[PDB]
Swiss-Prot record, chain A:
Belongs to the class I-like SAM-binding methyltransferase superfamily. MenG/UbiE family. GO terms for biological process: aerobic respiration; methylation; ubiquinone biosynthetic process. It comes from the Eukaryota. Pathway: Cofactor biosynthesis; ubiquinone biosynthesis. S-adenosyl-L-methionine binds at residues 47, 73, 104-105, 122. It is found in: Mitochondrion inner membrane. Component of a multi-subunit COQ enzyme complex, composed of at least COQ3, COQ4, COQ5, COQ6, COQ7 and COQ9. Interacts with COQ3. This is 2-methoxy-6-polyprenyl-1,4-benzoquinol methylase, mitochondrial. It is a peripheral membrane protein. Keywords: Membrane, Methyltransferase, Mitochondrion, Mitochondrion inner membrane, S-adenosyl-L-methionine, Transferase, Transit peptide, Ubiquinone biosynthesis. The keyword Transferase applies. Its EC number is 2.1.1.201. GO terms for cellular component: extrinsic component of mitochondrial inner membrane; mitochondrial inner membrane; mitochondrial matrix; mitochondrion.
Amino acid sequence: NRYDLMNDVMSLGIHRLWKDHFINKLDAGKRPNSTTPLNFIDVAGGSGDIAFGLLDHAESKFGDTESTMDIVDINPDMLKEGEKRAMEQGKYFKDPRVRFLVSNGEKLEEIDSDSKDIYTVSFGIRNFTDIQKGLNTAYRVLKPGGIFYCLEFSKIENPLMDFAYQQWAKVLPVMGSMIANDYDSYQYLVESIERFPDQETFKSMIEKAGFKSAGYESLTFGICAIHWGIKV
Amino acid sequence: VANRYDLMNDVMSLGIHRLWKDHFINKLDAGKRPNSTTPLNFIDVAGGSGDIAFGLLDHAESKFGDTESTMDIVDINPDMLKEGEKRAMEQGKYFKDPRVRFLVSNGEKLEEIDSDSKDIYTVSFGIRNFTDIQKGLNTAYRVLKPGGIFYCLEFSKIENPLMDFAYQQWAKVLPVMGSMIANDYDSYQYLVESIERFPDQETFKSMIEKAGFKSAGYESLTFGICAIHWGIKV
Ligand SMILES: C[S@@+](CC[C@H](N)C(=O)[O-])C[C@H]1O[C@@H](n2cnc3c(N)ncnc32)[C@H](O)[C@@H]1O
Ligand SMILES: C[S@@+](CC[C@H](N)C(=O)[O-])C[C@H]1O[C@@H](n2cnc3c(N)ncnc32)[C@H](O)[C@@H]1O
């Protein structure tokens, strides 16, 4: 919930709409005239907004109740909350299709090479101590024709909006400290967005990982962005 | 609609509003004691979603074993009360319960609520939206029994100058991000202005005393970003 709250606050809840757009744009899932089940992997899943979102979208639009989902997070306490959310909604709790896994996105040692059709990472890759290694691991995990999809904060192009965002980013750790004694969380959040490579640099890092037909779509003037790539 | 209100609460308090509400319920400490046989009559106003209402009944059950006290959840917005009924259904508690009623009504008048029928009156972050605050306080006095308790959780005036300074920068930038990210300057500016025009701790206390309440008082929370105000009928 700590990350849920910071995402709610930083984006004023609009991250929900970014996630809805992200899922609809990817448009992943087993088509009705096919019996091959897709193997999803959602890295840095946390409470599971994307993982459950992908599964829900695949069912309602395609009638897919076959595809498997691996939800991966480095933090066991963050993962548990995802499974805790799964029981209360009562849909993906104790489901053979859905696996919760404690693992580092830079390694993913438990995952087999060339085993996954769809890789997603949503607002998590910026927290990786090594972003490139995580991108290389993403490539390793996917099989030919596999789609990499990333939702993450980015660079705001417009100077006025960026200037307003910087002040927002300045006042957040101050307010987080005074009200919630949470300076470190908000400062690390703000600094992780600042350090993160812009739309073009990140695209190059995705290409450097080995992905082809790589591109991006800046959302809400580039406060965040959707990056993609296809294997081979 | 209720999601929108939960979001603005999270954003303005940075998620701390849940700690305010838990302190609010714990401080009130309401419920039929195990040495008593008389159930209490609760009224909750301007909280159709049920955050405080469900919390009050849960607390009374947990601490005292009180599973008999009645609760009237009152909101002017029918959409908010639908969500509360949806919450109660999905919760598996307080849905289709004779103890719990969901009622459409204006908090300034509470016409469907009889005089001297309630033991506890609670309003949480809703009274600042009342077009006339005094009318709401007078009505709260009317529905309460002798010995009835008025309890209020609402945004207030910050008493810590450094917290105030930080808040003023917050209040300026927040609606700007509202306009830029959410395409919604109005809601956030309206929220900031509704907090600004609300009476301070001493003024609101006076208004509660003008309603007729005795032994009135307040406790500032988080440097006075919000406050708990109370009053006892006779
Ligand atoms: C804001 S959340 C993202 C949750 C969810 N994907 C969303 O968009 O709301 C960040 C999550 O990434 C996880 N994380 C951070 N570093 C990681 C790493 N190296 N490998 C896997 N997960 C990581 C954190 O534990 C945290 O739960
Ligand atoms: C932000 S919410 C309250 C937040 C949360 N549900 C709680 O009680 O802590 C404000 C609520 O007060 C209600 N409200 C506003 N003006 C009112 C009035 N004059 N009478 C009754 N309810 C009112 C609104 O419909 C809205 O649902």
